[PDB]
Amino acid sequence: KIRIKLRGFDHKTLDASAQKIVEAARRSGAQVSGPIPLPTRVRRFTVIRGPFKHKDSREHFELRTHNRLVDIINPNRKTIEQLMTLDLPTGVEIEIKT
Amino acid sequence: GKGDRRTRRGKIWRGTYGKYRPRK
Amino acid sequence: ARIAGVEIPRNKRVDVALTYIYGIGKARAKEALEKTGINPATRVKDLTEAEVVRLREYVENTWKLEGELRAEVAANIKRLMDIGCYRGLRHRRGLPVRGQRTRTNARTRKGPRKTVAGKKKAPRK
Amino acid sequence: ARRRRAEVRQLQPDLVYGDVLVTAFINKIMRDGKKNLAARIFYDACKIIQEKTGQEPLKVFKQAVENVKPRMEVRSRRVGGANYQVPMEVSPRRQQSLALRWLVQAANQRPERRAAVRIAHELMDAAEGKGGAVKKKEDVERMAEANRAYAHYRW
Amino acid sequence: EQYYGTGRRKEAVARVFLRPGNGKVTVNGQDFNEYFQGLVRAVAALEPLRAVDALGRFDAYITVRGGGKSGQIDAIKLGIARALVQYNPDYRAKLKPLGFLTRDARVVERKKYGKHKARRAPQYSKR
Amino acid sequence: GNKIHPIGFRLGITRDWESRWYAGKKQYRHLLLEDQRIRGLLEKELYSAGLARVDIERAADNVAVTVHVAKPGVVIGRGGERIRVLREELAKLTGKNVALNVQEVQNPNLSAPLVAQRVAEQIERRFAVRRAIKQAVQRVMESGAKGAKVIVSGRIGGAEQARTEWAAQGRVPLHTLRANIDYGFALARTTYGVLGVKAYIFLGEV
Amino acid sequence: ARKALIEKAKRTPKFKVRAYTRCVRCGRARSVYRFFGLCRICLRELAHKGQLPGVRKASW
Amino acid sequence: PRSLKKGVFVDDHLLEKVLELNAKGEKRLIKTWSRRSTIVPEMVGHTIAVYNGKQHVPVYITENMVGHKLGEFAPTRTYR
RNA sequence: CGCCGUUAGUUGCCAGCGGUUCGGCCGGGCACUCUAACGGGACUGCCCGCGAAAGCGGGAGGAAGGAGGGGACGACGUCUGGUCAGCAUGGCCCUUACGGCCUGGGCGACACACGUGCUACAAUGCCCACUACAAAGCGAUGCCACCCGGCAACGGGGAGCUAAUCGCAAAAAGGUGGGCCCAGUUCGGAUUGGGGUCUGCAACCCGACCCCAUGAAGCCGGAAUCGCUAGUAAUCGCGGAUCAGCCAUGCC
Ligand SMILES: [Mg+2]
Ligand SMILES: [Mg+2]
Ligand SMILES: [Mg+2]
Ligand SMILES: [Mg+2]
Ligand SMILES: [Mg+2]
Ligand SMILES: [Mg+2]
Ligand SMILES: [Mg+2]
Ligand SMILES: [Mg+2]
Ligand SMILES: [Mg+2]
Ligand SMILES: [Mg+2]
Ligand SMILES: [Mg+2]
Ligand SMILES: [Mg+2]
Ligand SMILES: [Mg+2]
Ligand SMILES: [Mg+2]
Ligand SMILES: [Mg+2]
Ligand SMILES: [Mg+2]
Ligand SMILES: [Mg+2]
Ligand SMILES: [Mg+2]
Ligand SMILES: [Mg+2]
Ligand SMILES: [Zn+2]
């Protein structure tokens, strides 16, 4: 176990989270279980377009939360000092629970 | 009909549970 | 037969039949049959004289039924009209009592519509 | 239909008689989009056709259908005055549908406690030229033409 | 030994596996005729077979999930015609003109605001 | 009553977000509030700098803030002065160790917000609305830009019956997502009520 | 609303059943999306300004 | 249909005021605004002035009235 | 959204082998389904016919063919259209009240009238039992498996989930069996009596749910009048926002 689930609001920016987090123990290091998609959760808000009456206009927003899996199988500690101390994207989060 | 609360389907409409529609 | 005081169901299933009695319906039929021991399915015609009895001596001497109900219920309401009680006024008046709306839709408690006029100029909408 | 002309939808043929004049009848028997109910009604009705006559149901069915479709109907029209019931032809695709419809409606007029029995007896009676449904057909055609006087709007 | 097609209809996805055999179909660990029990369609999911001569020349085991049995029926109807092309690919000559290889892309229409039911608009009063 | 927000419309493309972080449901609420609190301060004590957008990135307690100004003098102060007071003015309210990078706006008259304000500033001073606008556009056209448009609402010229003044040159392809069309709005509090000033600036396709 | 009435801020409300959201922004008491703390309009306005992260307009 | 299980609510502004008057004499008119308090045996005999939102009211309190609340006897709105 | 591909295997399965408490349950695979990223595909490109050209008609191949299906997107302007009560904001007005705090009442009144809806008037049906097949969502001051108490609402215990992994969750029409017999009924569930549960300081005015009794009008609706062109109408259930609770049959 080396739980590493990645979740933010942008999917371009969840490549700058799976690529370098694999390109470290990819062909030089260990193995890695590959970045696995994992279904996303969207939240819709349906605000009425105007203030005051006009019951029937509305406009839909959403807040998509995209995910990935990774999980670095066979963990040498050399990659770790390289993996745990190299980052890049701002609006991303990490979870780590072996 | 969906009106009678002492029916199965009257309780499915209400989204509730009781003697007339047990929760498994 | 004559299951409950001055009452007489016939020729349909027994459980449906006993519904024709005042303080009784399905719920009290399924019970007073299971407890009395008669198959709910048989037509009333096919009941042993012995069976009708075991039923009648139970149903009557175990529940407030017929007149004994619908006269005490009427007195159970006079009590509210006796004191000051809101529901009492609401019973006197002849309007809902379970805190419903009265601007539209009290038709069942009031009875048929007693229509009246409008004003002078106004929308006849 | 201001723009184009609209094509008749080609309905998928039957599962038991392979006929499209049947799913046609089966759709009209259907309500609230419960198609399984409809089939179970009709195919049952076919089983009652087979009982009360040695004839294949499919030739009995088609027989009543042909027997119901009108050759004339009326269609209101005006220039002034009032709505003049104008007699006119009944273009084949409509004979098809008027027949199917009336058949089902007529079927559900019957006193027969359940459907299928209703459908059977109505499907049967109509083959024999009797039974209301043919009422509509005849009382349509008879009521049309009886306005021959206004038939000078041929189209 | 094996032959395979997918097949889809209203997000309903069948998995079709053709095998040489006797005509005994099996959908989701069950007899074809006791999973589509009572549905007068069903027998319609095999129409690619009884129209290229197959049925009892072949056997079929099937994974199915998503939707309701009529979509599940049509998604099979497809999945078989596909596996049947993975066989003799000449099965198209008299198979495509009948439909079968098409994928009914008809899907449930989005519910839209200001209407009750996407298209059913709310009724009104005084025009 | 028409027309959506040319920024909000294009948000997925051409134009990105102003705040830039991630947060669970138990967080987003008061977190985002803070972001706005910082934007609110960053205009009261930062008006004359001429500020376009206040970016706000975030990691766990590394709240970025990246004030875009045209005149990064007034932001930084005399020596490094003003930007010391403000970095610790963002610390009084946000207890979450902030930065305050400042990226100058190369050509202020190519960023709609700024343009929009210059026009609003002119009018608050009593001025030639109908002229000011045509001026404001020409500036955005002499500064490049494949097109531009500016709108002042009503009570023009301190009038009586609210109007709407126009002026627009080049292309302003409001319906296309492959756009890139800055949009800024300035209020114009006058002696006799407010006047809305919208500015649009089209600058290139893909 | 009335600046006085802005006192859900009033920490102790005697009993929670008097506690009631308002829009942190405009003070509205009547369409306050829990997630945001914003009301109907403030929500839409800020969304379009692009000031609340990861929120696009939804199309499906 | 009733409703209160256990803890048969009776507001306490007058719960002791009613039994502090059961140490001597039944004082005439002991007004409240708690039209929400259930009547309880120690209340029998007295006379409570219940508010309307407008007026207090002479509610002579008998024996039949017990399960009820005072508000049931102090009618609010007024009719044709 | 519809077909196909590459990337990715704590979701996937007689694809294919081993064990079985026969539960993908385990070893184990990534083929398939799926999840979510990046691509390919479609353009009157090919064919026959009319046309000066655009284009029109049919045919082929294809998952799809002429805008393949549904969104988002609202021109210069118009109604001196709506909103000073979301928010700003000019002017006007009140300043021991036109401001402020409370407790209580009212916004829920009822001779009447209309709008939008819900449940019906039933056999293509209602009831009960058993047995299938979804999508989209939500969830630790939470969702609540599971075991007891209770006719039940629910109460007391208590596992797993910070969620493709646990729970809400039962989908319901459907299918199989059984009942009902044309009846104001085993249709319909209004009304009222009674006893309870729950949330909240507090349910009289004025909450929802449970159980028992009651079992009203309603046999398809005058003149008028609304919606819908295809996965549409029709019908069947499922979820979410608001929110302690809830008057939701509303909305999305
Ligand atoms: Mg619109
Ligand atoms: Mg019933
Ligand atoms: Mg639907
Ligand atoms: Mg104010
Ligand atoms: Mg509240
Ligand atoms: Mg084995
Ligand atoms: Mg795929
Ligand atoms: Mg050409
Ligand atoms: Mg367009
Ligand atoms: Mg007005
Ligand atoms: Mg008050
Ligand atoms: Mg109101
Ligand atoms: Mg009206
Ligand atoms: Mg139990
Ligand atoms: Mg039966
Ligand atoms: Mg009708
Ligand atoms: Mg149309
Ligand atoms: Mg709720
Ligand atoms: Mg609801
Ligand atoms: Zn607000």
On the CB side of F198, CA atoms within 13 Å amount to 16
- Give the closest residue to F33 by CA, choosing from G46, G7, G40: G46
CA distances from F35 to A22, A77, C122, D61, F38 (A): 33, 39, 55, 76, 5
Q: Helix C27-34 and helix C49-59: axis angle, to 10°?
A: 120
Backbone angles phi, psi at D137, to 5 degrees: -50, -55
Token pair for F108: 């202020």
The gap between the terminal CA atoms of chain B, to the nearest Å, is 22
Dihedral of the alpha carbons of E83, E88, E93, E99, in degrees to the nearest 10: -10
- In angstroms, rounded to a whole number, what is the distance separating the alpha carbons of residues D66 and D64? 6
Rounded Cα–Cα distance for residues E126 and A32 (Å): 68
* CB-count burial class (<10 Å; 0-12, 13-18, 19+) for F105: buried
Judged on CB neighbours under 10 Å (0-12, 13-18, 19+), A28 is exposed
**What is the domain extent for residue E40?**
1-127
Q: CATH number of the domain that F182 lies in?
A: 3.30.1140.32
Interchain contact C84–H (C-beta under 8 A): yes
Tokens representing F33 are 């509030």
Extract the tokens encoding B23: 């929760």
| Phi-psi category of residue A34: left, alpha or beta, with phi > 0 → left and psi -120 to 50 → alpha | left
**3-class DSSP state for residue E12?**
strand
Indicate yes or no: strand I within 7 A of the C-beta of C7. no
Dihedral through CA D11, CA D13, CA D16, CA D22, nearest 10?
A: 50
Check residue C121 and give left, alpha or beta (phi > 0: left; psi -120 to 50: alpha): beta
Tell me the residue type at C89: L
Give residues with Cβ within 8 angstroms of A81, minimum separation 6.
none
> Alpha-carbon distance E116 to C47, whole Å?
55
- For residue A82, give both structure tokens: 């390289």
Q: Is G26 annotated as a binding residue?
A: yes
Maximum C-alpha span of chain E: 70
Relative to beta strand E8-9, strand E12-20 is antiparallel
CA H11, CA H48: separation in Å to the nearest integer? 14
Dihedral angle, C-alpha C27, C30, C34, C39, nearest 10 °: 170
> Token digits for F119?
């026009």
* Rounded Cα–Cα distance for residues B10 and D34 (Å): 22
Residue B22 CA to nucleotide I183 C1', Å? 31
Distance of alpha carbon C97 from alpha carbon D5, whole angstroms: 61
Name the domain boundary from F87, F106, F125.
Answer: F106
Give C-chain residues touching H75 at CB under 8 angstroms. 86, 89
Beta bridge partners of E17: E4, E61
For chain D, domain boundaries? 1-155
SS3 string, D57-117, reads HHHHHHHHHHHHCCCEEEECCCCCCCCCCEEEECCCHHHHHHHHHHHHHHHCCCCCCCCCH
Q: Are residues F93 and F112 in the same domain?
A: no
Kindly state whether F57 is in contact with chain A, defined as any CB-CB distance less than 8 angstroms. yes
Type of residue found at E92: R
Of residues A69, A66, A68, A70, the one with CA closest to residue A22: A70
Residue with tokens 């089966």: D26
Q: Under an 8 A CB cutoff, do G40 and A51 touch?
A: yes
Alpha carbon F89 to its chain centroid, in Å, reads 22
Q: How was this structure determined?
A: X-ray
Bridge partner residues of A59 (DSSP): A47
Q: Could you tell me which of D95, D98, D104 has the C-alpha nearest to residue D123?
A: D104
Closest Cα partner for F179 from F2, F8, F1?
F8
CA distance A56 to chain E (A): 5
CA dihedral F117, F122, F125, F127 (to 10 degrees): -150
Question: Pairing state of beta strands E25-27 and E58-65?
Answer: parallel
Q: Strand (E) positions, chain H?
A: 47-49, 58-60
φ, ψ for residue G58, nearest 5 deg: -90, 135
Q: Which fold has domain D1-155?
A: Ribosomal Protein S7 (1.10.455)
Running DSSP on this structure, what letter comes out for residue E121? P
SS3 F78: coil
User: Exposure of H65 by Cβ count < 10 A (0-12 exposed, 13-18 middle, 19+ buried)?
Assistant: buried
Protein chain G, residues 2-21, with a C-beta closer than 7 Å to any atom of nucleic acid strand I:
2, 4-5, 7, 14-17, 19-21
Tokens of C122: 């106004």
Beta strands A66-68 and A5-8 are: antiparallel
Using CA atoms, how far apart are residues F41 and F93, in angstroms rounded to an integer? 10
C16/B20 Cα distance (integer angstroms): 18
Type and span of the H or E element at C67: helix C66-70
Are E52 and E110 within 8 A, CB to CB? no
Separation of C26 CA and I211 C1' (Å): 13
Domains delineated in chain A: 1-98 (3.30.70.600)
- Within 13 Å, how many C-alpha atoms sit on residue F193's CB side? 12
Q: Could you tell me if E39 lies within 8 Å of chain D, comparing CB atoms?
A: yes
In whole angstroms, what is the distance from residue G31 CA to residue A71 CA?
42
What's the fold here for domain H1-80? 30s Ribosomal Protein S19; Chain A (3.30.860)
Q: Which nucleotides of I are covered by protein (CB under 7 A)?
A: 1-4, 7-10, 12-16, 32-38, 60-64, 68-83, 85-91, 99-101, 103-121, 123-129, 132-141, 146, 151-154, 162-165, 169-176, 179-182, 185-217, 225-244, 249, 251-252
Nearest Cα to Cα of residue A70 among A28, A20, A29: A20
Q: How far apart are CA F79 and CA F86, in angstroms?
A: 14
Chains contacting B (3 or more CB pairs within 8 Å):
none
User: What are the tokens at F7?
Assistant: 């920024």
Q: From the CA of H76, how many Å to the C1' of I120?
A: 37
> Cα–Cα distance between A54 and G42 in angstroms, integer?
17
- What residue ranges define each of the domains in chain G, with the CATH number in brackets? 1-60 (4.10.830.10)
CA atoms within 13 A on the CB side of D80: 0
Strand nucleotide closest to residue C85 (CA to C1'): I204
The three-state DSSP-derived secondary structure of chain G is CCCCCCCCCCCCCCCHHHCCCCCCCCCCCCCCECCCCECHHHHHHHHHHCCCCCCEECCC
Q: Which residue is nearest to nucleotide I202 (CA to C1')?
A: H36
For residue F101, what is the domain's CATH number?
Answer: 3.30.300.20
Same domain, F92 and F171: no
User: Which two tokens mark F72?
Assistant: 């990064």
User: b/e per residue, D26-45, with b = 16+ CB within 10 A?
Assistant: bebbbeeeebeebbbbbbbb
Thinking of the domain C1-71, which architecture would CATH place it in?
Orthogonal Bundle (1.10)
Give residues with Cβ within 8 angstroms of A50, minimum separation 6: A57, F1
Interface contact G8, partner F, CB < 8 A: no
- Burial class of residue E19, CB neighbours in 10 A (0-12, 13-18, 19+): middle
- Report if residue F1 sits inside a domain: no
Amino acid at C96: P
Is residue H57 within 8 A of residue H49, CB to CB? The reply is yes
* Residues in contact with C62: Cβ distance below 8 Å, sequence separation at least 6, in sequence order: C32
F26 near G38, Cβ under 8 Å? no
Q: Helices D35-51 and D117-127, interaxial angle, to 10°?
A: 50
How many separate helices (H) and strands (E) can be counted in chain H? 1, 2
Report DSSP letters for F31-70, one per residue.
Answer: HHHHHHHHHHHHHHTTSTT-EEEEEEE-STT----EEEES
Range of the domain at F166: 107-206
Q: Is G10 annotated as a binding residue?
A: no
What gap in Å lies between CA A47 and CA G41, rounded to an integer? 7
Q: Is residue A43 within 8 Å of G35, Cβ to Cβ?
A: yes
Determine whether the interchain pair E41/D43 forms a contact, defined as Cβ–Cβ distance below 8 Å. Answer: no
Structure tokens given for A92: 């991303």
| Cα F49 to Cα A46, C103, F40, F82, distances in angstroms | 37, 62, 15, 11
Same domain, yes or no, for F114 and F63?
no
The CATH code that applies to domain C72-125 is 4.10.910.10
Q: In this structure, is the CB of residue A61 within 7 Å of any atom belonging to strand I?
A: no
CATH number at residue E1: 3.30.230.10
Angle at F72 between CA F66 and CA F78, to 5 degrees: 120
